[PDB]
From a paper:
BQ.1.1 is a descendant of BA.5 and bears all five recent convergent substitutions (R346T, K444T, L452R, N460K, or F486V). Importantly, BQ.1.1—harboring five convergent substitutions—possesses increased [name] binding affinity, pseudovirus infectivity, and fusogenicity, which is attributed to substitutions R346T and N460K. Additional experiments using the S derivatives based on BA.2 and BA.5 showed that the R346T and N460K substitutions significantly increased the S-mediated fusogenicity independently of the S backbone. Together with our recent studies, the results indicated that the N460K substitution, which is detected in BA.2.75, increased [name] binding affinity (i.e., decrease in the KD value), increased pseudovirus infectivity and S-mediated fusogenicity.
To gain structural insight into [name]-receptor recognition by the BQ.1.1 RBD, we performed X-ray crystallographic analysis of the BQ.1.1 RBD-human [name] complex and determined its structure at a resolution of 2.78 Å. First, the interaction between N460K in BQ.1.1 RBD and the N-linked glycan on N90 of human [name] that we observed in our recent study focusing on BA.2.752 was verified in this study. Surprisingly, the N405 in BQ.1.1 RBD and [name] R599 were also involved in the interaction with the glycan on N90 of [name], despite not being detected in the [name] complex structure in BA.4/517. As a result, three amino acid residues, BQ.1.1 RBD K460 and N405 and [name] N599 formed an interaction network across the glycan on N90 of [name]. The formation of this interaction network is consistent with the enhanced affinity of the BQ.1.1 RBD against [name] and increased infectivity caused by N460K. In fact, while the electron density of only a small part of the N-linked glycan on N90 of [name] was observed in the BA.4/5 RBD-human [name] complex structure, the electron density of the corresponding glycan was well observed in the BQ.1.1 RBD-human [name] complex structure. Next, regarding R346T and K444T, these amino acids in BQ.1.1 were not directly involved in the interaction with [name] in BQ.1.1 RBD-human [name] complex structure, which is the same in other previous variants. Finally, it should be noted that [name] bound to BQ.1.1 RBD is in a closed conformation. In contrast, [name] with an open confirmation has been observed in complex structures with BA.2, 4/5, 2.75 RBDs. In the closed [name] structure, an unidentified substrate-like electron density was observed around the catalytic site, and the location of this density is identical to that of an inhibitor against [name].
Residue numbers in the entry:
A (entry chain A): 19 to 613
B (entry chain B): 329 to 527
The structure:
Amino acid sequence: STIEEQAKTFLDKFNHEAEDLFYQSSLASWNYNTNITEENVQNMNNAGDKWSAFLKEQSTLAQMYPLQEIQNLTVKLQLQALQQNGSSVLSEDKSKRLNTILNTMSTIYSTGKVCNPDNPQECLLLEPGLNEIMANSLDYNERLWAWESWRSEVGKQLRPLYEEYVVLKNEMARANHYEDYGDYWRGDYEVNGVDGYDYSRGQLIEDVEHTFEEIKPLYEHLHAYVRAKLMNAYPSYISPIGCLPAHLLGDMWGRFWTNLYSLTVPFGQKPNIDVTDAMVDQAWDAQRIFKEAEKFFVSVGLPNMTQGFWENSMLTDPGNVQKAVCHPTAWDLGKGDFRILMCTKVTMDDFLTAHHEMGHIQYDMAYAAQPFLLRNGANEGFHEAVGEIMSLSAATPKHLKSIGLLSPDFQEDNETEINFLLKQALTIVGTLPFTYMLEKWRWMVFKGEIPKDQWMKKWWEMKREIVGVVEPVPHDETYCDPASLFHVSNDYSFIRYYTRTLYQFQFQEALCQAAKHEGPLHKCDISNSTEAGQKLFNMLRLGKSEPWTLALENVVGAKNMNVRPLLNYFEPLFTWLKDQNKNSFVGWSTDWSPY
Amino acid sequence: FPNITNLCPFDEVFNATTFASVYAWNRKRISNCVADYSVLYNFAPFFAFKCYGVSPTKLNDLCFTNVYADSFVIRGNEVSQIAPGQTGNIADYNYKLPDDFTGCVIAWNSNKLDSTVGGNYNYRYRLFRKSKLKPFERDISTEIYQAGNKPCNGVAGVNCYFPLQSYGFRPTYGVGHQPYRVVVLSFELLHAPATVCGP
Ligand SMILES: *[C@@H]1O[C@H](CO)[C@@H](O[C@@H]2O[C@H](CO)[C@@H](O[C@@H]3O[C@H](CO[C@H]4O[C@H](CO[C@H]5O[C@H](CO)[C@@H](O)[C@H](O)[C@@H]5O)[C@@H](O)[C@H](O[C@H]5O[C@H](CO)[C@@H](O)[C@H](O)[C@@H]5O)[C@@H]4O)[C@@H](O)[C@H](O[C@H]4O[C@H](CO)[C@@H](O)[C@H](O)[C@@H]4O)[C@@H]3O)[C@H](O)[C@H]2NC(C)=O)[C@H](O)[C@H]1NC(C)=O
Ligand SMILES: *[C@@H]1O[C@H](CO)[C@@H](O[C@@H]2O[C@H](CO)[C@@H](O[C@@H]3O[C@H](CO)[C@@H](O)[C@H](O)[C@@H]3O)[C@H](O)[C@H]2NC(C)=O)[C@H](O)[C@H]1NC(C)=O
Ligand SMILES: *[C@@H]1O[C@H](CO)[C@@H](O[C@@H]2O[C@H](CO)[C@@H](O[C@@H]3O[C@H](CO)[C@@H](O)[C@H](O)[C@@H]3O)[C@H](O)[C@H]2NC(C)=O)[C@H](O)[C@H]1NC(C)=O
Ligand SMILES: *[C@@H]1O[C@H](CO)[C@@H](O[C@@H]2O[C@H](CO)[C@@H](O[C@@H]3O[C@H](CO)[C@@H](O)[C@H](O)[C@@H]3O)[C@H](O)[C@H]2NC(C)=O)[C@H](O)[C@H]1NC(C)=O
Ligand SMILES: *[C@@H]1O[C@H](CO)[C@@H](O[C@@H]2O[C@H](CO)[C@@H](O)[C@H](O)[C@H]2NC(C)=O)[C@H](O)[C@H]1NC(C)=O
Ligand SMILES: *[C@@H]1O[C@H](CO)[C@@H](O)[C@H](O)[C@H]1NC(C)=O
Ligand SMILES: [Zn+2]
């Protein structure tokens, strides 16, 4: 027996045990997220302990086979991935404490409630109640109340937990030989051992910081434009030179400016609206939303959703019978079990998010053909971008006209295209400075750069500086405002949403060449192009078997992320925004704040 | 003893409340009875009824010296291997059909029957064997497969694996991983009086 044949037989026996334990751990985690109870916590803990003790022994056994004599590469890849920096050996006592911190922060975010000061019985959760106020209200006082109440009652609850969260997440990362937990998350993009296609953890910080500096001009102009239209909506609350108040931004944290569209449409009255109203008028259902998203993926040659997907997903708020984590997520449990968890409302926001989450699932199904150890996205940015290149096509008025949400005779003049490009900018461009700053603060907090006594002095120093957004109420260090976001309190890396935003326009550009689209990128709709889906699928099927640099270079022609296609997409709006800010100021100073 | 004909016990095989593991597959010899293959229908939706070398529509007019019904449970995406000229974990190590197989393969989804929330580990299959199975051969040996070059001495360990693998069927699995009950009818014509006939 050669060492290779023994490694193959080891990987075979490994895959059959690993898939069964991963499924139990996955299903236990699903039960907790759809239904938050103390019993479902300890089931998740026990299934997670069994799963890590399995990797503890397997990653040790895999050392018995030297890579330098495995001629079959795909065997080499599974072996490398099994011994690679995933030990997560913590002491039993410190492993149990980090879980309690994680589970508590997870429970507080989804079950945290602000209650009436005069009536403790009537309360608002974040998901059904406060999100509706932060997405649809127009009262300055009401938005301010919801913004502060959530950060004062739930935010302060998460502050001590998050401090011990970083001291344990950093201790885990160092035992796996990373500089900090931030370097650990960055290792997702790491590639080495492949000449010319390598990529370091440090190279992401340079590439994010330099690509973002090329983004600064486009965002600064949209910022000034939104500022003026917001000056009309609110009488004396905003000056032409200061930052934008954080509680007027379209959602709880200002992560997207999409709900600001109703106040900022360039040509709002005369061009027909491009938004939710017709869904409600046509009595659309949460099922119709996903059936339409499923219809889109099928139209490019991708499969339908499984029968189990419809039986096992939670696609609406379950109600008060169980406490669920309502934030939209996509789940690959293995064994052909695919589910989406989402508390879907009937909005154009939810319509496009359905395409996003189904993009995850389609990626999961495509690379299900890989060996177990290679079933993942090329990187986190790839995974969070697949649904977005479909959202780009589904959001275009050409597609909305063909699926019945716009008039059967739609006038696509010069003006309606600027409406489209602005709303596209409110979402895609608006989330870029929000994303970069939040993750940079985490990296700077994970690294020894931001001390305990000034965790919020720097978070808002970076909001005003980088994002152009200011705190309406002064927050001392009892507050933990970043942890009031789902991804921060639920232990999710956030730079995934920055790299994917460059990746999508790169992919969309290549896919619109595959579909032979003729004009600028923003008129492109790949709906019925089975050839375009073929190019996409040939990469999705790869998983982590190739480095993301090569998978990216074999579809777009660039071994790295790039800002060119994103800026070509928004060029008509870029030169249009210039014309609108003629007697306005583009930029801001940090020296202004309400209180 | 009187001259009276039995009705072929196809219900004993197709309607068993528990099927065998594919590594230890059951075989029932059908003989000296009147077979009515017309009752073999209404299985789980989109079942497979795959015959080779004999027409199932003419089956109620044929006679054979013997009929053999082999039964077992397998994974969904393994069903295609129960046919002549096939390779894979099942056709190589668990159940093999020959090239000249004359018979039928009925396989239907048994997720409601054989899956369990806690996982059904009772159904197993052979994952390692020293060589391929000859057609219609059965191996039930629990001997430790020696992958490495050190002897195992009957103890599972490094490079020494227990040769059987449990499926662990759960109802929430996808169809490719769901259990399928399988019955393999083999129609045998020898130089002998044919004792299994249709109506
Ligand atoms: C690196 O190593 C790997 C593994 O060591 C190697 O991949 C193997 O390549 C050999 C080629 O000789 C494959 O063997 C052939 O398989 C043919 C049928 O393929 C199908 O069935 C395979 C096994 O059946 C499994 O399928 C069911 C579900 O379908 C599953 O539940 C069970 O696991 C069951 O055992 C299956 O692995 C295979 O899928 C692989 O191959 C496809 C094809 O490209 C690929 O797309 C997949 O992603 C996947 O990698 C497929 O589903 C079979 O027809 C053929 O038979 C010939 O040989 C036999 C024996 O000599 C003869 O008897 C017969 O007459 C034919 O001549 C042959 O057996 C093997 O399946 C691969 N295994 C794996 C895990 O991929 C790579 O090639 C190596 N890389 C390099 C560069 O060398
Ligand atoms: C939401 O999650 C809770 C978990 O706290 C679910 O309740 C528990 O579900 C388990 C799993 O079926 C059940 O436990 C059962 O307990 C009984 C009595 O002790 C016994 O027959 C078994 O020991 C069995 O495991 C039971 O339904 C329940 N256990 C409790 C409440 O102690 C609940 O079902 C979930 N809700 C939904 C809608 O899924
Ligand atoms: C992708 O391809 C599908 C199928 O070819 C396209 O759907 C088709 O859309 C046209 C135009 O709406 C339908 O034709 C006519 O539509 C009117 C609606 O006013 C109605 O009277 C009839 O339905 C009539 O046929 C056509 O029926 C419809 N086909 C199907 C199968 O639904 C779709 O528009 C294409 N999408 C893109 C973006 O190209
Ligand atoms: C395994 O058990 C099932 C359940 O008893 C057997 O299915 C039954 O077989 C009989 C005999 O052909 C059939 O009954 C039919 O009922 C319909 C009305 O539903 C009637 O119009 C027909 O004339 C006939 O009497 C039917 O397939 C089924 N009856 C049920 C499920 O109620 C099956 O035959 C057994 N398998 C074997 C191999 O014996
Ligand atoms: C994807 O699923 C849809 C339905 O979910 C399929 O459309 C159905 O196809 C069946 C059989 O082909 C027929 O009853 C009708 O044509 C459709 N029914 C309904 C209710 O829409 C569609 O064919 C599937 N496509 C793929 C590629 O799997
Ligand atoms: C409308 O068209 C005119 C000329 O046809 C052009 O000057 C103007 O920029 C267009 N407006 C928009 C919003 O595209
Ligand atoms: Zn996502």
